[PDB]
Structures are given as structure tokens and as C-alpha cells.
Write an enzyme that holds these catalytic residues in place. Structure first.
Site, mmCIF file in Angstrom:
data_model
loop_
_atom_site.group_PDB
_atom_site.id
_atom_site.type_symbol
_atom_site.label_atom_id
_atom_site.label_comp_id
_atom_site.label_asym_id
_atom_site.label_seq_id
_atom_site.Cartn_x
_atom_site.Cartn_y
_atom_site.Cartn_z
ATOM 1 N N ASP A 161 -5.705 9.164 3.449
ATOM 2 C CA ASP A 161 -5.252 10.268 2.200
ATOM 3 C C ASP A 161 -5.596 10.855 1.310
ATOM 4 O O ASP A 161 -5.362 10.991 0.020
ATOM 5 C CB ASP A 161 -3.784 9.287 1.967
ATOM 6 C CG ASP A 161 -2.478 9.450 2.769
ATOM 7 O OD1 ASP A 161 -2.907 9.839 3.436
ATOM 8 O OD2 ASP A 161 -1.510 9.303 2.802
ATOM 9 N N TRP A 174 -2.066 -1.652 10.637
ATOM 10 C CA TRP A 174 -1.117 -1.214 9.475
ATOM 11 C C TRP A 174 -0.235 -0.598 9.529
ATOM 12 O O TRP A 174 0.157 0.490 10.032
ATOM 13 C CB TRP A 174 -2.150 -0.349 8.554
ATOM 14 C CG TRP A 174 -1.520 0.313 7.332
ATOM 15 C CD1 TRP A 174 0.015 0.663 7.161
ATOM 16 C CD2 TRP A 174 -2.126 0.830 6.245
ATOM 17 N NE1 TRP A 174 0.490 0.955 5.598
ATOM 18 C CE2 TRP A 174 -1.663 1.018 4.980
ATOM 19 C CE3 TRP A 174 -3.313 0.278 5.658
ATOM 20 C CZ2 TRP A 174 -1.411 1.115 3.673
ATOM 21 C CZ3 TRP A 174 -3.784 0.730 4.291
ATOM 22 C CH2 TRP A 174 -2.945 0.949 3.108
ATOM 23 N N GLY A 233 0.965 -0.620 0.437
ATOM 24 C CA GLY A 233 0.307 -0.202 -0.187
ATOM 25 C C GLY A 233 0.721 1.628 0.114
ATOM 26 O O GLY A 233 0.581 2.461 0.143
ATOM 27 N N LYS A 271 -0.862 2.477 -4.409
ATOM 28 C CA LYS A 271 -1.652 3.589 -4.719
ATOM 29 C C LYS A 271 -1.893 4.210 -5.761
ATOM 30 O O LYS A 271 -2.817 4.604 -6.486
ATOM 31 C CB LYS A 271 -1.285 4.878 -4.143
ATOM 32 C CG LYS A 271 -1.359 5.089 -2.379
ATOM 33 C CD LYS A 271 -1.950 5.718 -1.736
ATOM 34 C CE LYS A 271 -2.673 5.414 -0.421
ATOM 35 N NZ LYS A 271 -4.531 6.161 -0.988
ATOM 36 N N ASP A 320 9.119 4.933 1.485
ATOM 37 C CA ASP A 320 8.056 5.801 0.505
ATOM 38 C C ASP A 320 8.346 7.666 0.613
ATOM 39 O O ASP A 320 8.067 8.752 -0.161
ATOM 40 C CB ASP A 320 7.519 5.748 0.304
ATOM 41 C CG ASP A 320 5.726 5.792 1.253
ATOM 42 O OD1 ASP A 320 6.161 6.204 2.497
ATOM 43 O OD2 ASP A 320 4.650 5.234 0.776
ATOM 44 N N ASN A 330 3.779 0.911 9.511
ATOM 45 C CA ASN A 330 3.838 1.224 8.148
ATOM 46 C C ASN A 330 5.528 1.881 8.500
ATOM 47 O O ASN A 330 6.294 2.509 8.629
ATOM 48 C CB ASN A 330 4.151 3.045 7.865
ATOM 49 C CG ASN A 330 2.844 2.798 7.365
ATOM 50 O OD1 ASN A 330 2.412 2.012 7.248
ATOM 51 N ND2 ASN A 330 1.857 4.061 7.566
HETATM 52 C C1 NGO Z 1 -3.043 3.727 6.715
HETATM 53 C C2 NGO Z 1 -1.943 4.842 5.396
HETATM 54 N N1 NGO Z 1 -1.674 4.783 4.230
HETATM 55 C C3 NGO Z 1 -0.742 6.000 3.692
HETATM 56 C C4 NGO Z 1 0.361 6.031 5.121
HETATM 57 O O1 NGO Z 1 -0.416 4.962 5.734
HETATM 58 O O2 NGO Z 1 1.621 6.022 5.110
HETATM 59 C C5 NGO Z 1 2.192 5.171 4.652
HETATM 60 C C6 NGO Z 1 3.673 6.037 4.320
HETATM 61 O O3 NGO Z 1 3.956 7.052 3.879
HETATM 62 C C7 NGO Z 1 1.676 5.326 3.008
HETATM 63 O O4 NGO Z 1 2.418 4.344 2.045
HETATM 64 C C8 NGO Z 1 0.271 4.987 2.874
HETATM 65 O O5 NGO Z 1 -0.265 4.631 1.696
#
Ligand code: NGO
Ligand code: CA
Length: 572
Positions: free
Chosen positions: A232, A322, A124, A155, A329, A324
């Protein structure tokens, strides 16, 4: 050694031979994927089956009464591989394959089962999505480490996010997803297909029908688990009442209608503590079987007892985590190859699931993934360091020491907007710190430290050279190569800079000029490799080694300029 370690293990300090002649009971009634692993590994009775099968009737009190549980027994008279369910049998076999060593097995009795219900990976991240070949390799790896979950949600896939989430995948891609799904199935992994519609969703019938039509197309390609991501985004798609209604609708008209849907999962818009009535609206309205994802106290954080109670109180269910890490990234010039640590080991009951968002570098992520698999299966027995070593040795057995050396100086994230850091280079950090201080103050550095820094640079050079030419995991080597070049350059710079520390005025000149050349080569790699729009370049050994070198260089050049009245450039 067993990864993940089983819940219960009794070892008898005897060993048995893998039977040259054997009698197999249960081959036709047991999980075919488990029977397949067994036969490739292969008179003495071997019994394989799921509880309920005639093959394992005699051991049914032995089989743990848990989803994915299994009893495994080896002794001189017989072998028993008994799952509580079909996936439990497959899990027995993955434990069994690790016991086998040189056509021999220890005499053991294991009762095992996962502590966390869903365990795996969410693709993700932001950046280049994993290649098709990368993903195939991941799914084999997940089944081996008893990870039952893969959440597909890149994404940048336009058939996953806005605006083409509404469109069926084109033929070519759909055939690829279908193969992924079959291979997930073969490895006892649930392929969870995620959709990300919230950036341009209209809370009307037209978009709601399109979302169901899309889920139906995915069902036709074999998909049996589903997720809806609202992370996001901005605009009207962030509405929590609307989101819950949509997920409930999907549940009512789809997940409750199809005979065989497994996971239905949602990622909320406010997915961490620092970013918040949104959460209570979801906790109260969303059907209780639906999962809610959570990244912790911050976008990037480790999961604590207080952090997980805080969320579970609001969502009225155990959070589906989730995590991270090792996702890079937001620090794309770094590889994060260190141990998985920082997560509380006593809160298994407070989580529905635990997945890790990895790097765009698929093979390089297996170090953390293997560790996350270990932690999520048996957190009470999770061993940070040992599991990191086991991960590395599993991934690159022909060059385990060299990968350890490279990974242990490629762990920290450097300064970043998320404030999240990892340890790196802890081995040499005392010796480094002492060395540096003896210059700041104007004293004699301890010799042993000098030599420890020498030995470290030497091992770095060896590991870089060997890793470059390794052919056991080429895709891994392709991923890390630009950091390998840069890591080698760091080590050579290190050797030359120490040589500058040991005094000849013309020798010092040669070494200085040599170091200027090495800096330039490092600038060049940083300017031409991995040139993404966000954090371009290649940085390595940043926490301790690169500052140590740069500081030592700036210092010794100054001393020299003060001694011989020169104006050598002290910059780096
Ligand atoms: C739940 C979530 N969605 C986003 C966010 O956490 O930060 C991550 C790391 O920067 C990114 O990869 C991800 O797409
Ligand atoms: Ca069966």
C-alpha cells in the site's frame, strides 16, 4: 475435544486419575516453559523431555520427526510428554491441559505436529493499534492454540512506518516492546518485528544503513524475527529489483551474521493476483530462504488450490499467506464474529505460513484467530462450525450461548468496495424469506415463522442483557458494548414491529410511536458511537434481521394508511 485436533489420536475408552503421587523424570532437562505448565497442572511415572533427553530415550521412535512435533501418551502405568524439539514439548503440554477434566485424563496416544510451518497473526490493520494489555493477552492465547507467529506491524506506529522507521523506539515504548518479546518467548511465539519503509525510502546507502541500525536496535531488545513490508505504498519504494536487493542485503549482513535469527519475511507491493514483471523479478532475485507474503486473488479473499499455484509458480516458493479476515478496517461499523471458512483444506504443502489480519478489536478477533490456529495446524481435519463453537466456549464459557447468538447475527460485512461478504443469520433466513414474500404477494404468513421470529428477537434481548453484565472477559465486553446496545435495540424493534403486524387502531398507534422511538435511539447510537473518519457508527444484524424489520414496518404502515386514510411516516 482437542483444538487444534492432532494429526493422530487413538482413544481407549478408559480414564485415569491425575496421579496424587507421581515421579517426574526430565524436569531439569525439558523445555522450562513446558515444565512450568506441567507443574501448575500437578508413584506414577511422568516423563517429559525433548528427543535426545535421557528422560524420553525409551520413546524416541514414538516422537514424530517434524519441527514442533510431539508424542503424548496417557495410560494407567505412565504419562509421556515428548517433544521432537523444545517447542514440540510445549505443544504436548497445551494438548495435555485440554485432556485434563476434573482431575481425570482419558487413556490416549497422540502423535502430532503442524501441517503448516508458520501459523499466527499479523497486527497489520489500519486503525487504533492494539493496547499493550491487549497484545499481552493475545500472546498467551497464541501459545495455547499452538500459533508460533506474531507479526508486529501496526500501520499507524510511527517507529514502524514513514518517516520515523529510521529512529530507535523511545525508551518507554522500547521497554514495552521488550516485554512483549519476553512474553512471546515464554509462550513459544516468534515475535516478528516488521518495518514499513517504502513510502519514503531512498535507494541509497544512508537509508540502507539506517534500516540495518534500526534492525540492530530491535535485536538488542530481544527481537529474533524480522519483516519488511512494501504494501500500500506509492513512488520509488515499489521498485521490485530494489526491494529484493535490500532484503538480500539484510539477509547477507544480518540474518546470516547473527547466531539466532529465525523468520525473515517480506510483503510485496503487488500482494494479490488482481494487482498484476514485478512478481517474477522477486521470485527470481530474492534469496530462497526469504518469505513472500500474499493475500490471495484479491485484497480480501479466501485461498484456493488454483490461487496458490498461480502465486507459487511466480515466486518460486510456497507463499506465506496473509489472510485478510476478520480485519474490518474498511467496514469499521461492523464486527465480523462469524466462522472462518472458504480456505482450501488440502493445500498445506503449498504454503510456508498462514496468518490472519484481525480487527482493531483484539478480544473480539479471538473467535477467528482460534479457528485459524485450528485450520493451519491441521487443515485436513478443519471443521468450520465446530471450531467456531469451541472458540466461543473457550473465550466466554460463562455465557457461550449468548455470545453465539450475538456472533451469529454479527458476521456479514455489508456492501463494500472489496466485494467480500460472509453468511449471517442462516438459522432464521428461510423463515424470514417466507414471511417477507407473503406480504409482497398479499398472502397469509405461516404462523411458525412468526413465532420463530419472535423466539429469535427474544433470545437476542436475553443475550444482549447478559453479555453487557458479563465480568469473565471485561475487555471483550468493552469492545463489543456499542454493538450490543444496538443489537438489543434491533430485537426490541423486532418485537414491536411484529406486534404491529397483529391488528385495534389505537394499539397500532401506540406500537408505531414506540417503534419511532426505538429507530431514534438507534440513529443516536449510530451517530455518537465509534465515530471514525471512514465508516462511522454501529451496524448490527444487517444481512437478514434489519432488512426484515424495516421492510415489515414499511409494509404494515402502508396497509394502515390505506385502511384508515392516515399519513403515518413509513420511513426507516
Ligand atoms: C497486505 C495488506 N495490507 C493492507 C491490505 O492487505 O488490506 C488490509 C485490509 O483492508 C489492510 O489491513 C492491510 O494493511
Ligand atoms: Ca532437552
Amino acid at each position: 475435544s482437542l483444538q487444534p485436533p492432532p494429526q493422530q489420536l487413538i482413544v481407549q475408552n478408559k480414564t485415569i486419575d491425575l496421579p496424587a503421587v507421581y515421579q517426574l523424570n526430565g524436569g531439569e532437562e525439558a523445555n522450562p516453559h513446558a515444565v512450568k505448565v506441567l507443574k501448575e497442572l500437578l508413584g506414577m511415572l511422568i516423563s517429559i523431555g525433548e528427543k535426545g533427553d535421557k528422560s524420553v530415550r525409551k520413546y524416541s521412535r514414538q516422537i514424530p520427526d517434524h519441527k514442533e512435533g510431539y508424542y503424548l501418551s496417557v495410560n494407567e502405568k505412565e504419562i509421556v510428554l515428548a517433544g521432537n524439539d523444545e517447542r514440540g514439548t510445549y505443544y504436548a503440554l497445551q494438548t495435555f491441559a485440554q485432556l485434563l477434566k476434573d482431575g481425570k485424563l482419558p487413556e490416549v496416544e497422540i502423535k502430532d505436529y503442524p501441517s503448516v510451518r508458520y501459523r499466527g497473526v499479523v497486527e497489520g490493520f489500519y486503525g487504533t493499534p492494539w493496547s499493550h494489555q491487549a497484545r499481552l493477552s493475545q500472546l498467551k492465547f497464541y501459545g495455547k492454540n499452538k500459533m508460533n507467529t506474531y507479526i508486529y506491524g501496526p500501520k499507524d506506529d510511527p517507529y514502524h512506518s514513514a518517516p520515523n522507521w529510521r529512529l530507535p523506539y523511545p525508551d518507554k515504548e522500547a521497554a514495552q516492546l521488550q516485554e512483549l518479546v519476553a512474553v512471546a518467548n515464554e509462550n513459544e511465539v516468534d515475535f516478528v518485528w516488521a518495518i514499513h519503509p517504502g513510502q519514503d525510502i531512498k535507494w541509497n546507502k544512508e537509508d540502507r544503513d539506517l534500516l540495518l541500525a534500526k534492525f540492530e536496535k530491535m535485536y538488542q531488545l530481544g527481537v529474533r524475527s524480522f519483516a519488511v513490508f512494501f504494501n500500500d505504498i506509492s513512488g520509488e519504494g515499489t521498485n521490485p529489483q530494489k526491494q529484493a536487493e535490500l532484503l538480500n542485503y539484510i539477509d547477507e549482513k544480518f540474518a546470516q551474521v547473527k547466531p539466532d535469527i529465525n523468520q525473515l519475511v517480506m510483503c510485496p507491493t503487488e500482494y494479490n493476483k488482481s494487482w498484476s514483471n514485478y512478481l517474477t523479478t522477486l521470485g527470481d532475485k530474492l534469496n530462497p530462504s526469504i518469505q513472500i507474503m500474499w493475500t490471495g486473488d484479491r485484497v480480501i479473499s479466501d485461498i484456493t488450490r488454483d490461487g496458490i499455484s498461480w502465486i507459487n509458480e511466480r515466486i518460486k516458493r510456497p507463499a506465506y499467506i496473509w489472510w485478510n479476515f476478520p480485519v474490518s478496517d474498511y467496514v469499521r461499523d461492523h464486527l465480523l464474529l462469524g466462522p472462518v471458512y472458504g480456505n482450501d483444506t488440502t493445500i498445506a504443502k503449498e504454503m510456508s505460513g498462514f496468518v490472519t489480519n484481525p480487527m482493531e478489536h483484539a478480544e473480539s478477533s479471538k473467535i477467528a484467530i482460534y479457528s485459524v490456529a485450528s485450520y493451519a495446524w491441521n487443515p485436513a481435519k478443519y471443521d468450520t462450525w465446530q471450531t467456531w463453537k469451541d472458540a466461543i466456549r473457550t473465550i466466554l464459557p460463562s455465557a457461550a450461548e449468548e455470545l453465539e447468538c450475538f456472533a451469529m447475527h454479527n458476521s456479514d460485512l455489508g456492501p463494500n468496495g472489496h466485494g467480500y461478504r460472509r453468511e449471517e443469520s442462516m438459522d432464521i433466513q428461510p423463515a424470514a424469506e417466507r414471511f417477507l414474500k407473503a406480504f409482497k404477494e398479499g398472502k397469509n404468513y405461516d404462523k411458525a415463522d412468526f413465532e420463530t421470529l419472535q423466539y429469535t428477537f427474544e433470545r437476542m434481548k436475553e443475550s444482549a442483557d447478559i453479555l453487557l453484565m458479563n465480568t469473565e472477559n471485561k475487555p471483550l465486553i468493552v469492545e463489543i458494548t456499542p454493538w450490543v446496545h444496538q443489537f438489543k435495540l434491533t430485537a426490541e424493534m423486532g418485537e414491536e414491529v411484529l406486534k404491529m403486524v397483529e391488528g385495534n387502531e389505537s394499539y397500532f398507534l401506540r406500537k408505531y410511536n414506540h417503534v419511532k422511538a426505538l429507530q431514534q435511539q438507534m440513529f443516536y447510537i449510530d451517530q455518537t458511537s465509534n465515530q471514525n473518519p471512514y465508516q462511522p457508527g454501529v451496524k448490527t444484524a444487517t444481512r437478514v434481521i434489519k432488512p426484515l424489520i424495516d421492510r415489515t414496518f414499511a409494509t404494515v404502515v402502508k396497509f394502515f394508511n390505506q385502511k384508515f386514510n392516515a399519513h403515518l411516516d413509513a420511513t426507516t
